[PDB]
Structure 1
Amino acid sequence: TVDFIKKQIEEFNIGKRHLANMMGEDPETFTQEDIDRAIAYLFPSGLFEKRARPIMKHPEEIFP
């Protein structure tokens, strides 16, 4: 699954660029903490399970 990881890595960087574009911030310093607060705003999911909320992180950290 090496190629699948590589595909996830490249599209995550592209997806990060789109999120920075719509958020109106600097894409060079669009840190992960900024991404978490951005996702929590665009998709306000009210659920008690902390792991059930929408996430968009590094595929290396997500995939085992």
Structure 2
Amino acid sequence: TEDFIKKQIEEFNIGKRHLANMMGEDPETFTQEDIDRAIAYLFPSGLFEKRARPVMKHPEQIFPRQRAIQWGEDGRPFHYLFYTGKQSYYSLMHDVYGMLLNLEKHQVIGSR
């Protein structure tokens, strides 16, 4: 839940400070890359699957971005296309269609 995510964020901040203390670096300038290097040094793992090695990333990345329930206490969903079951995809399609309509109003090499 959202409160669980807040608790995880607080725990991650405290752990980041503790890891900066352990590695003897400034907690205020301890980037995510420093966190990863410190974790790899303190908890070495030769497992080939990188997703299986120890990780202490931000909760925004460790937890799936599917988020908690998509409605508040009142139960009203936040997104107006929620009942489509694919609110992200259909919102993206709606935005693209609006862009095409605006293009109608007004009027390959290094990418895949």
Give the TM interval when normalised to the shorter protein. Answer: over 0.9
Q: Secondary structure at the match of 2:61?
A: helix
Identity in percent: 95
- Aligned-residue offset at 1:20: 0.3
Distance in 1 separating the partners of 2:51 and 2:22: 25
Q: Secondary structure at the match of 1:45?
A: coil
Q: Runs of 4+ in structure 1 displaced over 6 angstroms? A: none
Note the residue ranges of structure 2 that are not aligned, 5 or more in a row: 63-112
Q: Secondary structure at the match of 1:44?
A: coil
- Aligned-residue offset at 1:27: 0.7
- Aligned-residue offset at 1:9: 0.4
- Aligned-residue offset at 1:50: 1.1
Distance in 2 separating the partners of 1:16 and 1:49: 24
Q: What TM-score comes out, normalization by structure 1 length?
A: 0.93
Distance in 2 separating the partners of 1:32 and 1:12: 11
Count of aligned positions: 62
More helix by share: 1
Give CA-to-partner distance per residue, 1:3-56, whole Å, 9 cap, x none. 100000001000000000010011110000000000000001110111100000
Distance in 1 separating the partners of 2:49 and 2:9: 27
Q: What TM-score comes out, normalization by structure 2 length?
A: 0.54
**Higher RCO (Cα < 8 Å, 6 or more apart):** 1
Distance in 1 separating the partners of 2:19 and 2:26: 11
- Aligned-residue offset at 1:61: 1.3
Q: Secondary structure at the match of 1:56?
A: coil
